[PDB]
Design a protein around this ligand. Structure first.
Ligand SMILES: OC[C@H]1O[C@H](O[C@H]2[C@H](O)[C@@H](O)[C@@H](O)O[C@@H]2CO)[C@H](O)[C@@H](O)[C@@H]1O
Length: 366
């Protein structure tokens, strides 16, 4: 079972879980109820497993795209924020955590990918993907490569795939899957070719991209606000700008709204909300986490005004506008799963962009 008398939280390893713990500390100081913050692997898959038998964390943290599935499976408790509190957050954040007319989680921060470049190696970042190949061989004089980002998670390659047309569910329509169209293929082919021509490696994952960039071995990388922290610890003179365009079109990243949901099986649903509404979602609460690992554009209309000034957050939102906020429909896990296989098979060579995307379409629509 879920032990009552405490709060067990779950958040991804790339987020400021220490900053969250800190917030948990002052909760135990003002209430006596201790808080355990953990970051297990594939927590977004783990939760639905355990939470189905009535176990797991009291509150789960993840981008909103997964929450609809959880709510469909009766794993999330409905939240009860009074008008006053709802008004403390931007109306669009709420829409992202609404399912079948009920709010199924609390919005935290808006996440969008941006281009991170080493101002010293690249005082002027490219504006197009097409000019990156040349830039890569040009950078050989300095013994560097052009770009280097995570190729294992479709979240990171999706912007290039959508630039020229590719899409998941048209504006949330299940009856319209575009991971097989011209755009998708065009974009994925450009990526595959970058690997074909030795400008990128199919095995570059999150760890490899970060080390390579923070160690100043690469001129650019792609990531979210949560990555800024470690870049600060490397003294690298970086900048966060717009993502390169493809075929004249802007890269369209899937925007995610970090969210906090309460386990439907939690005996502590009452403590959870006090903690989420009066300890975390407060100016002082978010800074605690944002000081650990940046959260990006937070939903707390107040503490965000003291952050929207940051050129980084500005770029974050700029790319956010060039793309779209993800749907929260249950079908999303199937989408990400399909695309994941496709990009990895196409990248590695086990398949042609055509076969891979077709199969991705099939996996989503069957
Ligand atoms: O790659 C598919 C994956 O994309 C998104 O995951 C992001 C997440 O939103 C960010 O907060 C951060 O953790 O990076 C992740 C990529 O590794 C979706 O939110 C997720 O459901 C999906 O599986």
């Amino acid at each position: 079972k879920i032990e009552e008398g405490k709060l067990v939280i779950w958040i991804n390893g790339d987020k400021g879980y220490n900053g969250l713990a800190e917030v948990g500390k002052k909760f135990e100081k003002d209430t006596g109820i201790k808080v355990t913050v953990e970051h297990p692997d594939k927590l977004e898959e783990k939760f639905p497993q355990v939470a189905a038998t009535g176990d797991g964390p009291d509150i789960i943290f993840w981008a909103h795209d997964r929450f609809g599935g959880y709510a469909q499976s009766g794993l999330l408790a409905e939240i009860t924020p009074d008008k006053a509190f709802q008004d403390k957050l931007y109306p669009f954040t709420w829409d992202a955590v609404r399912y079948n007319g009920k709010l199924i989680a609390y919005p935290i921060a808006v996440e969008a990918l941006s281009l991170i470049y080493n101002k010293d190696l690249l005082p002027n970042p490219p504006k197009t993907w097409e000019e990156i190949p040349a830039l890569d061989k040009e950078l050989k004089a300095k013994g560097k490569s052009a770009l280097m980002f995570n190729l294992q998670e479709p979240y990171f390659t999706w912007p290039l795939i959508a630039a020229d047309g590719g899409y998941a569910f048209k504006y949330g329509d299940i009856k319209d899957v575009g991971v097989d169209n011209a755009g998708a293929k065009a974009g994925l082919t450009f990526l595959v070719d970058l690997i074909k021509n030795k400008h990128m490696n199919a095995d570059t994952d999150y760890s490899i991209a970060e080390a390579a960039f923070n160690k100043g071995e690469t001129a650019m990388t792609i990531n979210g606000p949560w990555a800024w922290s470690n870049i600060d610890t490397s003294k690298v003179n970086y900048g966060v700008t717009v993502l390169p365009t493809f075929k004249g079109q802007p890269s369209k990243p899937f925007v995610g709204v970090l969210s906090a949901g309460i386990n439907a099986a939690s005996p502590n649903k009452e403590l959870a909300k006090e903690f989420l509404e009066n300890y975390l979602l407060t100016d002082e609460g978010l800074e605690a986490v944002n000081k650990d690992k940046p959260l990006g554009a937070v939903a707390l209309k107040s503490y965000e005004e003291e952050l929207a000034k940051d050129p980084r957050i500005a770029a974050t939102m700029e790319n956010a506008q060039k793309g779209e906020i993800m749907p929260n429909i249950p079908q999303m896990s199937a989408f990400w799963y399909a695309v994941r296989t496709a990009v990895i098979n196409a990248a590695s060579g086990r398949q042609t962009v055509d076969e891979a995307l077709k199969d991705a379409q099939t996996r989503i629509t069957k």
